[PDB]
Each structure stands twice: as structure tokens, then as C-alpha cells.
Design an enzyme around this catalytic site. Sequence first.
Site, PDB file in Angstrom:
ATOM      1  N   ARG A 256       0.881  -1.163   0.000  1.00 31.21           N
ATOM      2  CA  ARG A 256       0.000   0.000   0.000  1.00 31.21           C
ATOM      3  C   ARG A 256       0.918   1.213   0.000  1.00 31.21           C
ATOM      4  NH1 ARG A 256      -4.978  -1.768  -1.493  1.00 31.21           N
ATOM      5  NH2 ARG A 256      -5.769  -3.262   0.053  1.00 31.21           N
TER       6      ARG A 256
ATOM      7  N   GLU B 211     -13.413 -11.790  -3.358  1.00 30.36           N
ATOM      8  CA  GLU B 211     -12.045 -11.392  -3.061  1.00 30.36           C
ATOM      9  C   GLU B 211     -11.334 -12.437  -2.219  1.00 30.36           C
ATOM     10  OE1 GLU B 211     -10.387  -8.505  -4.055  1.00 30.36           O
ATOM     11  OE2 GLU B 211     -12.037  -7.478  -5.057  1.00 30.36           O
TER      12      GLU B 211
ATOM     13  N   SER C   3     -12.659   7.635   7.515  1.00 23.52           N
ATOM     14  CA  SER C   3     -12.135   8.914   7.948  1.00 23.52           C
ATOM     15  C   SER C   3     -13.089  10.016   7.516  1.00 23.52           C
ATOM     16  CB  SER C   3     -10.760   9.157   7.339  1.00 23.52           C
ATOM     17  OG  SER C   3     -10.219  10.332   7.905  1.00 23.52           O
ATOM     18  N   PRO C   4     -14.204  10.197   8.219  1.00 21.54           N
ATOM     19  CA  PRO C   4     -15.317  10.955   7.628  1.00 21.54           C
ATOM     20  C   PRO C   4     -15.095  12.453   7.598  1.00 21.54           C
ATOM     21  CG  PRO C   4     -15.910  10.057   9.793  1.00 21.54           C
ATOM     22  CD  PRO C   4     -14.563   9.471   9.431  1.00 21.54           C
TER      23      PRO C   4
ATOM     24  N   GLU D  66     -15.721   7.244   2.341  1.00 22.60           N
ATOM     25  CA  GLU D  66     -15.583   5.795   2.263  1.00 22.60           C
ATOM     26  C   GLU D  66     -16.141   5.091   3.484  1.00 22.60           C
ATOM     27  OE1 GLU D  66     -11.581   4.237   2.136  1.00 22.60           O
ATOM     28  OE2 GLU D  66     -12.280   2.364   1.229  1.00 22.60           O
TER      29      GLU D  66
ATOM     30  N   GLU E 227      -4.957  -5.959 -12.170  1.00 22.57           N
ATOM     31  CA  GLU E 227      -5.054  -4.865 -11.214  1.00 22.57           C
ATOM     32  C   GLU E 227      -3.730  -4.597 -10.504  1.00 22.57           C
TER      33      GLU E 227
ATOM     34  N   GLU F  83      -2.094  -6.522  -8.559  1.00 23.75           N
ATOM     35  CA  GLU F  83      -2.144  -7.070  -7.206  1.00 23.75           C
ATOM     36  C   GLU F  83      -1.108  -8.182  -7.071  1.00 23.75           C
ATOM     37  OE1 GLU F  83      -6.221  -8.300  -6.904  1.00 23.75           O
ATOM     38  OE2 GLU F  83      -6.690  -6.894  -5.273  1.00 23.75           O
TER      39      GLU F  83
HETATM   40  N1  LIG Z   1      -5.510   4.583  -5.071  1.00 20.80           N
HETATM   41  C1  LIG Z   1      -5.820   4.016  -6.234  1.00 20.80           C
HETATM   42  N2  LIG Z   1      -5.646   4.723  -7.367  1.00 20.80           N
HETATM   43  C2  LIG Z   1      -5.927   4.161  -8.543  1.00 20.80           C
HETATM   44  N3  LIG Z   1      -6.415   2.956  -8.793  1.00 20.80           N
HETATM   45  C3  LIG Z   1      -6.595   2.273  -7.653  1.00 20.80           C
HETATM   46  C4  LIG Z   1      -6.331   2.716  -6.372  1.00 20.80           C
HETATM   47  N4  LIG Z   1      -6.644   1.736  -5.448  1.00 20.80           N
HETATM   48  C5  LIG Z   1      -7.084   0.742  -6.176  1.00 20.80           C
HETATM   49  N5  LIG Z   1      -7.066   0.993  -7.518  1.00 20.80           N
HETATM   50  C6  LIG Z   1      -7.523   0.108  -8.583  1.00 20.80           C
HETATM   51  O1  LIG Z   1      -7.804  -1.167  -8.066  1.00 20.80           O
HETATM   52  C7  LIG Z   1      -6.751  -2.093  -8.429  1.00 20.80           C
HETATM   53  C8  LIG Z   1      -6.307  -2.772  -7.164  1.00 20.80           C
HETATM   54  O2  LIG Z   1      -7.362  -2.594  -6.191  1.00 20.80           O
HETATM   55  P1  LIG Z   1      -7.032  -2.799  -4.642  1.00 20.80           P
HETATM   56  O3  LIG Z   1      -5.927  -3.814  -4.666  1.00 20.80           O
HETATM   57  O4  LIG Z   1      -8.312  -3.273  -4.015  1.00 20.80           O
HETATM   58  O5  LIG Z   1      -6.589  -1.468  -4.106  1.00 20.80           O
HETATM   59  C9  LIG Z   1      -5.703  -1.252  -9.163  1.00 20.80           C
HETATM   60  O6  LIG Z   1      -5.143  -1.869 -10.309  1.00 20.80           O
HETATM   61  C10 LIG Z   1      -6.521  -0.094  -9.710  1.00 20.80           C
HETATM   62  O7  LIG Z   1      -7.185  -0.431 -10.907  1.00 20.80           O
HETATM   63 MG   LIG Z   2      -7.987  -6.013  -1.883  1.00 17.91          MG
HETATM   64 MG   LIG Z   3      -8.525  -7.557  -4.805  1.00 12.96          MG
END
Ligand SMILES: Nc1ncnc2c1ncn2[C@@H]1O[C@H](COP(=O)(O)O)[C@@H](O)[C@H]1O
Ligand SMILES: [Mg+2]
Ligand SMILES: [Mg+2]
Lengths: 195, 200
Positions: free
Chosen positions: B70, B103, B124-125, B130, B153, B155
Site C-alpha cells: 500500500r 475477493e 475517515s469521515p 468511504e 489490477e 495485485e
Molecule cells: N488509489 C488508487 N488509485 C488508482 N487505482 C486504484 C487505487 N486503489 C485501487 N485501484 C484500482 O484497483 C486495483 C487494485 O485494487 P485494490 O488492490 O483493491 O486497491 C488497481 O489496479 C486499480 O485499478
Molecule cells: Mg484487496
Molecule cells: Mg482484490
Amino acid sequence: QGITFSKNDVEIIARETLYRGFFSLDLYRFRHRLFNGGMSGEITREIFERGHAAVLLPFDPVRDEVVLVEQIRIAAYDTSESPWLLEMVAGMIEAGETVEDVARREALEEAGLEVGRTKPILSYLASPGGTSERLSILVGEVDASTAKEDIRVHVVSREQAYQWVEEGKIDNAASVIALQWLQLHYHNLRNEWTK
Amino acid sequence: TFSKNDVEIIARETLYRGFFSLDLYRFRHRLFNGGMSGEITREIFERGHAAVLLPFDPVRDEVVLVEQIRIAAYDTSESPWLLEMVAGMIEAGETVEDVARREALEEAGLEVGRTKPILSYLASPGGTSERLSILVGEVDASTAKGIHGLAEENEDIRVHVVSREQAYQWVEEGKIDNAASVIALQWLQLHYHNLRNEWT
Ligand SMILES: Nc1ncnc2c1ncn2[C@@H]1O[C@H](COP(=O)(O)O)[C@@H](O)[C@H]1O
Ligand SMILES: [Mg+2]
Ligand SMILES: [Mg+2]
Ligand SMILES: Nc1ncnc2c1ncn2[C@@H]1O[C@H](COP(=O)(O)O)[C@@H](O)[C@H]1O
Ligand SMILES: [Mg+2]
């Protein structure tokens, strides 16, 4: 055991400003090491940058009460019962301020309470997929008989406050985390602060 | 007592539109002294909402954590790789439970049995809309192996099967320090005895 990689396993190519207002939105452009070896290609993520915060759970260990502050959070509007949330004392940390200094000062400004001793709860990232924000929570000793943005101060029993977490009436991350922690630790905390 | 009727949302102006959005909320609201505020504006990070799954093996008293980078953690963390819960965004048309179960398979190779809601929270309102909804999901933790995540994505995900005790100790030690995982594991520390009985 635990995490595989360190800061040295990323390459932050750019943090490009997408929006610059009171807060910022930055496009992080980076590469990072892969579990099976090698580096990713360039990845970009939009990251909301609003600095970091200090959070104070005001707990009266004599009375087993919590002080909550009520104020409007408009971002809650679309998904919540009400945008007026019941929250912990909290404030942003500005340059050179410590978590404890902000927590103690905000207790006085928001709840009208002087804090006595404090202990750390924990420090957490609010939503690290999309924001850098870190919030550091302390529990602070208060005398809930002491009387005092548009804030209303509530004094409730710990049991009521935690029940409102279970019921979803309190559902902001800082308060949920602090009150779950209190439910797990309050016995020892009362012991320590009433000795 | 105030309610949404005591708020006037004058406008939401999109400040930035990309993968996510930043909107300026322009609004007025009642004051506890009985008046009405002037015009207030807030920059709100609009990224939609998320589903979170705590994978719990009640036979073994184990949890499955996922490890992934992250990058936003970089500025304040020892490492930007975090130990987290299975989680995903809820796209238009999706639902919390379906996303959570999907997921769990995509990120950890887990089939999920029963689920129970834990809670739904605002991350974090003060600055983002979100909301994340956490489920606990019944899993056989021995089936979680390897590297997961969808390369479409970007990941790259590693699974960590540990005792519940170890996972909670990592919360205490600051080694798990993202809101979803902290909330889920604190909840599990408060409820695991009854939950194990329920799922036995
Ligand atoms: N901060 C972010 N900025 C841009 N795309 C994001 C972001 N967070 C998630 N994504 C999108 O979601 C994919 C991964 O999602 P996640 O792993 O759930 O964050 C990435 O390839 C993007 O397509
Ligand atoms: Mg995830
Ligand atoms: Mg995922
Ligand atoms: N989302 C936001 N957009 C613009 N300004 C903000 C936002 N959040 C906080 N502020 C400013 O920071 C002050 C303190 O915010 P808070 O810590 O939420 O009470 C507010 O009174 C505003 O001046
Ligand atoms: Mg505040």
C-alpha cells in the site's frame, strides 16, 4: 515471520500533484518488488494527502464513563443515519506538534476536559489504499463531572458507548477502534488509574 | 437532536475526476445554539465503498492475513507492505457479501463457508465518504497458499496463516495497523469464543 519487504524494495518515481487545495491529491508513480522476485513495472495510485491526526478517548476510570463529542461530518451524509457523528476528541497534527500535545490540547478545546494520565491505544492507517492518513489514539484520564467547529459534549457509560459500536450508532473508525480497545483493556486501565 | 433535514447541501462540485474523485461539498447546517451556519466547504475524497472479509478458521482458531503493498503507507510506516484483511471495492451493482466472498478466492484462494457481519465503519469521515463493511468468513486456513492478486489490477499478494493469538498480538505490537484489520481483529478478540461455538 511477518512482512516480506522494506522501504528499500520500492522506487517512488514521482508524487505528482493532481489537486492542491486545503488538502492534496497526489498521483504516486512507483515500482515495487514482487514476492516471486524482480520489480513491477510503473504503477500509479491516487492518494489523498491530509496529514495525520491525534485521537483521544476520554475515559473516567472512577465512574466508568466515556466522553464523546458530537459534530457534523458532511462526508458521512450519503451512507449514514446522520452526518452528526459521535466521535473521539481529535485534531490534525501540525508541524512540530506531538500526538500527545495535540490530544491534550484538543481535549480542552473540544470537550472542555483536562486530561490527566494518558496511555497509547494504537496508531492506524485509516484507509491505506487511497489515503496516507495515520491517526494515533491515546486514552486519557478524565473527570467526567468537569463541564465545558460546532460541538456538543456527551458523557455516557462505557457500556452504553460500546453497545452503540455493536449497534452501529458509533461507526467512525477512530471511535470504533478506541472503544473496542477500551472494552478489551478497561479492567486493567481502571486498576491502574484508581490504585 | 439534528438530522439530515438540518443540513442544506448547496452543491457538490467535482474538483478532480480520475480513477477516484475529489468533490467540494458546499453546505450549511444548524448549530446547537439554534442558529444556522454560514456556508461551509469541505474537500471530500470519493472513492466508493468497500467490502472486507476476516477469514477465520474456527476449528484451528486461525486467521488468514494477506500481505500486499500500500504505497500510501510509505510516509508513516516502517514498510509500505501491510498485513491486511481480504478486501475489495464494491463497484456499481455489486454487494458486500458477494465482493467479500469473491475477493477471498482472488486474494487468498479461499472458499468461504458461513459469514456473519462484524460492522460497517467510516474510514475517515472528515475527508472521505468511504465506508467499509466487514464480514467474518468461515474458512479452512490450511487451503490458503501462495501468491495471489490479479495482475490486471497489479495485485501481488502473499498469504499468512497464523493463529488468532498471533494476529492479535501483531495488532498490539503495531505490526498490523490498518483500520480494517484492527477493527476486525479487535472484534474477533471480543467474540471468538462465541463464534467458535457457533461454527463448531
Ligand atoms: N488509489 C488508487 N488509485 C488508482 N487505482 C486504484 C487505487 N486503489 C485501487 N485501484 C484500482 O484497483 C486495483 C487494485 O485494487 P485494490 O488492490 O483493491 O486497491 C488497481 O489496479 C486499480 O485499478
Ligand atoms: Mg484487496
Ligand atoms: Mg482484490
Ligand atoms: N475536508 C476538508 N476540506 C476543507 N477543509 C477542511 C476539511 N477538513 C477540515 N478542514 C479545515 O480544518 C479545520 C479543522 O478540521 P477538523 O479537525 O475536522 O475539525 C476545519 O475547521 C476546516 O477549516
Ligand atoms: Mg477535532
